[PDB]
Amino acid sequence: MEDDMACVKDLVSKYLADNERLSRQKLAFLVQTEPRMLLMEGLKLLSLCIEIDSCNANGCEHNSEDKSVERILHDHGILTPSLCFVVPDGYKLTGNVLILLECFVRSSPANFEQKYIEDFKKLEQLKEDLKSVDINLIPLIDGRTSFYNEQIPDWVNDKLRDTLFSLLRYAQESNSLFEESEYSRLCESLSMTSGRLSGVESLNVLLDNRSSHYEEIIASCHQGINNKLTAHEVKLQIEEEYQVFRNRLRKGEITGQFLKVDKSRLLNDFNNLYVDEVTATKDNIEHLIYQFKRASPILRFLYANIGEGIKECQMQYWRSFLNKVKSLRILNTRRKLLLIFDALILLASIHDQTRHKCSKGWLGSCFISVNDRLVSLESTKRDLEKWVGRRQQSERSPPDKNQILISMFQKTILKATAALKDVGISVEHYKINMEVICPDSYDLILNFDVSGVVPTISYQRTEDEKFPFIMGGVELLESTDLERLSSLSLALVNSMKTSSTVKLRQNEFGPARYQVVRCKEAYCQEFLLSGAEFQLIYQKTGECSKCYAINDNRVGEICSFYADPKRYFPAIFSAEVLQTTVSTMISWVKDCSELEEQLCNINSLTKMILVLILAHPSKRSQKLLQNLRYFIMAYVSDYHHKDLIDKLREELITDVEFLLYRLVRALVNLILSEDVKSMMTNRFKFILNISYMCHFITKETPDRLTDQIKCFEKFLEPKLEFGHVSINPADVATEEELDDMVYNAKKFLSKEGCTSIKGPDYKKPGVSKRFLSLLTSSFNNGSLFKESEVKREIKDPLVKSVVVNKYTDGSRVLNYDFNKLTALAVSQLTEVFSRKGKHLLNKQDYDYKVQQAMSNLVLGPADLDEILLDGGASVYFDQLKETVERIIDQYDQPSVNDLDEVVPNKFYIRLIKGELSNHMVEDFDYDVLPGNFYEEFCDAVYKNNKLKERYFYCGTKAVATRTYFDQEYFQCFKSILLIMNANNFKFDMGRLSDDVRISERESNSEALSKALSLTNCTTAMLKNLCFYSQESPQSYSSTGPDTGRLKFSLSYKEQVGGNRELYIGDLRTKMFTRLIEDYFEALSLQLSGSCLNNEREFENAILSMKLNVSLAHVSYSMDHSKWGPMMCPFLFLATLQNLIFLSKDLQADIKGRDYLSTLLTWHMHKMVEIPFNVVSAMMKSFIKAQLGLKKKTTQSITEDFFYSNFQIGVVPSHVSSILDMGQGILHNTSDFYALISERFINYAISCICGGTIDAYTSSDDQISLFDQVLTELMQRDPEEFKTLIEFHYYMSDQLNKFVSPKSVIGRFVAEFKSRFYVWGDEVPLLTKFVAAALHNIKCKEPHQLAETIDTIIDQSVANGVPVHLCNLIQKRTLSLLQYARYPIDPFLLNCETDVRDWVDGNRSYRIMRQIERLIPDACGRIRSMLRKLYNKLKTGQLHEEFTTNYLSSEHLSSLSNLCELLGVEPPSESDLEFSWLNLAAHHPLRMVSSIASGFVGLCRTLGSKCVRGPNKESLYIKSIQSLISDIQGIEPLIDSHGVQYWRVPLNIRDGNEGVISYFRPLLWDYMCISLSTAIELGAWVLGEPKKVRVLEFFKHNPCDYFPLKPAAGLNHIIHSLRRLYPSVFEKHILPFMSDLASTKMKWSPRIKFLDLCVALDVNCREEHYIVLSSELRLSHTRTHTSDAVDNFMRQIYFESYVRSFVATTRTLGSFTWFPHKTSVPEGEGLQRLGPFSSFVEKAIHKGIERPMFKHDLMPVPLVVHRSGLWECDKKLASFTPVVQDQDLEMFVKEVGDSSLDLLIGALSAMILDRLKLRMQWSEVDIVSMLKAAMPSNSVKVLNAVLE
RNA sequence: GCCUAGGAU
RNA sequence: GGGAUCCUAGGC
Ligand SMILES: [Zn+2]
């Protein structure tokens, strides 16, 4: 700790500015050794610096020797009788007036004003005495709120502050030095404030340690470049390059890379694109539609022809009851559970049959028994026979099988009921019959014969003949297929609620167990199409791809397939949507005369496409549709890339895709049809929207492993050609790695072009020195700016999951073990063999025997091994055997298992474990267990000393120890759990599966806590958690800080098409990157053109675009490939080290540049990790290929790259190359680079030709808007235009920026960020928004999905979607919700919306509309009543007799009280009876990824106790339904769409408060919602609704639009917050963004409306819309800075009268009403400043802190007197704004509270000095104002003022 | 492979 | 990716 004081003493000796006035305390601090002495001297030094800086900035000389005002005056030559001893911190005299000063620091507005008022009273108590010598005193006060002075570098400042606080943090010393008051004041003074600068300059508190490796890098980055070239010079180089390029090109030495377009060739190649197996020339629609319906199982089932055709049985009740019993894990699943449970349902069906001849619940020999299981009957009889036989033998080794069977039945049923009756309710709802069990049944069982069909499931494919129906019977134009598909998809989705059961029959014995299988069956689901039923059958549960089978009763097993439950979602219940989609889509192109005939064919084709998408959803069918957009984009263009068509040829596997290809090719050939020309825009829209029919599938991933391998290959494969791949770089970098790094850094800049015997070689990384020098020089010469930059010099730019590492020692592991991994792989392989491999290969194959040997090796139960030796593989096993043998030979803190030591009946424990496995501890149920059990458990735990001290404290155990004695057992049980932290292999597998990892993961905040808790300032700030904290390093090498290097990790982010990469960091990597990110973004913010962060740029982009397509100017829409993995931080550093910013200052520039150099140098050395499963799978491939068990495909380069390093020893773990930039990490710097480079390139092209170009960017995309000249030239000299484009390609390639083959050039479209535009018409996107809105449901409260879908629909409607679609979607969602039977309240969603209900409505306005529609003739007067009420209130007549009198008050008859307080008749007596059931009127509903799983979770959660009691309990929803159904005065009511709302009588409104506690009346909610919305929106929403019939039909062309705008002081809000709720205000706005502790507000206008609005609220963009003017008719319409400147003026004027204050840069700015350099133009309120205009400009709006002199109006300072400005005994000028009644009211309120003579004198003086200027007072009153202000004594004050 | 009793899912 | 039984003891 001594080193701390040492180094800080060194700093304060060095960096302290030379001034002898600091020397004294300097000495006093540089000599002490006692801690307390050092703290005192340091704090005194800091306060001295503060007061010095203050007295300098104000203009008062520093009282150094600490004189006294008596002495201060008497040594100045005046007489002073006697004073009280006061010590000033500075003073000054001017003639007969005096100026004092006093300053301090306080960081809390509560403890701020105290010092202010104390100093003011201490000064006035001396002014009163001073007044009698004819001398004026002016008591200045200053209130700085930070110790950040100006004579001291700030990093030294806080480096001193924190070490002082630490030395002060001696516990014993702090205690035995002072009390808690001053301790608390001091600790919050060294608060480690975030300061005013960036947060990286703190680097200067650490060593350099930059010995040798850091030099040559900078040299190379600075060696060849020449960043000084003049402006004119660059023209020469540019011209020479252009000339040599054109010359060497025209002679045909380089390619052309660009082709002109022709529709013929494009169509021809698009047709013959896949021409190797689509043996077709032309296409007939008829044969197509014919062979479609007979394609594949689902299709052949849909369009088929089937189905030309309540009992309260005794098979359901039993089943429901047994299901419920099974749910709770009561019974021990042991040697034979489910068999008896099957026998019981067998007897149930037997009994039920012979009474009413039921025909249900049966397929051949099958019956859905318990958990959707479909058992046979024969094997049941056999196993029952065998069971009773061996049981009789056990009785032998008397009774008959009947007797023992009924005995078991009686025993199990009795145990069942006995367990149930502990807590569970009984037969009361379970209406069962104990006659089912006959006194003899086993015989009756053995005499049951049913005949029928047999069930089968066929795995392998078949032929198209086992289908016993007639294929083509349905028709396209009808909508049966969609409903069949909906039903089937729902039957699929529902296949997840099954729980993993325990099978009964292995069902097969032999390798045919994957061939057609039928002995028994397994689980099954039920669904109805129109008439009869159908069973859907599967075998194993979960959510993994498997087989299925569709069984029926009249025939067996219509088909079978290979689907997967998820990914089939977005079709359920949505049938009348898709049809409407297709219809409105067709509706566009239906007027093309040249297409009149075969139009119906188009219809069929469109429909067919959609059904195909829905029937066979698969990965590689998405990209085919997506890529289509680029083709159509190319069609309308002019020039396209040379190598385009070879992109749309990815990969196809099975047939269906080729069917889709043929269909779409036919449709394109028919739509395009070169001999038709009429409607181009509509066909454009049609095809384009057809291309977006890809989102309909899903966004998820098909697999995991082969999804990770792809991304890993994408990562690695391009970093190998360049020839630089390091491996396992240790934290201490050896020399060879540094050497290779230098060599590669040199190689990177070795690019060349157009001057060589080889010419340019595209598609290879690197930058050439010529172009880089040209760029840098042309940038430094200011040849890339405009007036918005030359006039504004660039100010200094300095003013999810996270990985947790492992640890074995000081070091950190970085390499997996070899032999451990070998053992792991072997084990896994043995598992794979044991599960499936053993049932596929023959026993006389060598591979089978090998696997057998390796399995009996690894677990417990040579001529073959000799042949193995002859098969080469000899030594591999010889070593591996002993290796893994030795690996396998090598292998009281309170916990959860201890429960088994207390609770003997385990069933309770299983209950508890389930409940915890569902809900948190905080919301555990009270009634899961018997009430006595809690007390008995608490007793049995408090007895046993062990667990007692393990959870009780004898001296969080405190809260439990205390509560147990007080006998609140439930809180005790919950607490003991909150401590419990519940929230044949011969070795241990899990330990191995954990040892051979390296990195683990954690959430965002779980680590932020564990960080912030281990430091002083518990306010999370950037530069506090890595610089000044425990566990941080001291110095740093050229590689990284002494903690280590910058790790990372890999994963994938999924989208449509392919998947992008995802880097993940640790805490430190994030913390350090964030600084560079913020820096570069702040820097880019000054320059115009970027569009990644801003908003008001993107709209300018859109406006420029829309403007471009009116004159046919040639747009150029680009893109960029491999942007991520082909950028390098070396390039950023190199272009930075040559950047020269503002040239006025000298050093801080290079300081920042060096800091950034160090940061980038750290970043260049990252150590990317490699995932685990990738390594496991590749090792598996290796160990296979070694023996070559199953020869796979020919290995790519990655497998060899691995195996090479693998069969030498080392297993590759980390790779640290140079070539790759982070993918998504270093965004802002990449955008900066792209912007600068693009501007330079456009500059060059301007230099060559005679035109201009405008561009933009987000991260890699771009546009280019050719000027008029470059457009109009293109039509005469195509050669020159093409060569310009080519030279652009070349140049832009030289700077390491490529162009993807999908860019285009055109005159008819313009693309940006996927937002297309055309002339005249506009292009919507229907399919995208529809497919988005179809699946956006998760497992939240059903009151949130409402606003979710409402937001989605509001966003969509703005883009030309027609509203009918939206209503259909809303109805679909409501039906999906009703499927779970959640009783729909009134306001859940408004399924009636219109076109006015979005463009001018909120989320709730539509609620008001549905209510208005529901129950009229009541609101028809409530509206007028609220209208009168609001009209009266808006002018503030009562303004309080409603909020604090009615709103909070009990809504009992308050309405009638309003109606009598306003004079309108109250409602009827049969009005209050309306209400609406609200679940969760006490506490929100308790709750217990993907989408399907989310939906099944939401479907499950409802049932299981979604109800909280009065205090805390649990119930159901059916319960409350019954308990309402009891009371015979409660009448429900429904609407057409379905909206429950009730009628309950006021006569029993009380007297039965049991269930009625939930209900809530409707008109109350209507009133309050209406008032709130009206206050918020425009008050026009309280007219009278109406429907119009004033229109005749007009021929509505399908494309016609009409843009629209929606129909709509923060300082005052903040004022009211600080005036009403101070505690909430200080802790939520000041630390967020504010510093206004030293600010006054005692003179500010007030508003009553806003005040009461805020009191209620605390008590209780969307630019344009684009719609069709063919809809705008059928609707309804309803019937109805200068301020701030004048506020500051009146504030100053009012303060001028209360006292006298000096006018300086700190007095004025200290107020609140002031334009503190906000968004204000040059001249806005400068006319309303009088004598203060120039000061704001010349002084305030430049950063100049000085006092006011006489030269500031056109050497004594100025004094603000009453109204007019005064110098020493003379007036120069004045100013006086206008006053109002309310301002005077607030004035006389706040001033005339305690004293009187002050108000009288002030008013008299104001009247006097305002009369002598002859202004007029006739505009206001006096007497009534006084009365309204002083309600009891206005007479005497009237007399006083008027006298 | 079976019966009884229990434990774990 | 596509069929769930494991341990200990007692009588066998
Ligand atoms: Zn029946």
Numbering used by the authors: 1 to 309, 318 to 405, 410 to 811, 825 to 886, 896 to 925, 939 to 1002, 1013 to 1040, 1055 to 1559, ...
Paste lines from the article:
The large (L) protein of LASV is a multi-domain molecular machine that binds the conserved 3′ and 5′ ends (the ‘promoter’) of each of the two viral RNA (vRNA) genome segments (denoted L and S) and plays a central role in the viral life cycle, which is entirely cytoplasmic. The L protein contains an RNA-dependent RNA polymerase (RdRp) activity and catalyses both viral transcription and genome replication. Transcription is initiated using a capped primer derived from host mRNA by a yet to be elucidated ‘cap-snatching’ mechanism involving the intrinsic endonuclease (EN) of the L protein and possibly its cap-binding domain (CBD).
Two further structures were obtained from a sample in which the L protein was incubated with a truncated promoter (5′ nts 10–19, 3′ nts 1–19), which lacks nucleotides 0–9 of the 5′ end. One 3D class from this sample, obtained by focussed refinement on the promoter-bound region, (DISTAL-PROMOTER, 3.89 Å resolution), closely resembles the full promoter (PRE-INITIATION) structure, but additionally reveals a new position of the EN, without inhibitory peptide bound. In the MID-LINK and DISTAL-PROMOTER structures, the EN has flipped by ~160° around a hinge between G195-G199. The EN active site faces away from the rest of the polymerase and is exposed to the solvent, free of the inhibitory peptide. Instead, inhibitory peptide residues 1087–1099, as well as PB2-like segments 1759–1770 (lid), 1852–1860 and 1894–1896 (mid), 2077–2081 and 2089–2091 (link) pack against the back of the EN, stabilising it in its new location. Similarly, the α-bundle of MACV apo-L (with its different topology) superposes with the pendant domain in LASV L, showing that these flexible and linked domains must rearrange from the apo-state observed in MACV L. Finally, the position of the pendant domain in the LASV PRE-INITIATION structure is incompatible, due to significant steric overlap, with the location of the inhibited EN in the APO-ENDO or 3END-ENDO structures. This important observation provides a plausible rationale for full promoter binding (as opposed to just the 3′ end binding in the secondary site) inducing a flip of the EN to the alternative uninhibited location observed in the MID-LINK and DISTAL-PROMOTER structures (see above).
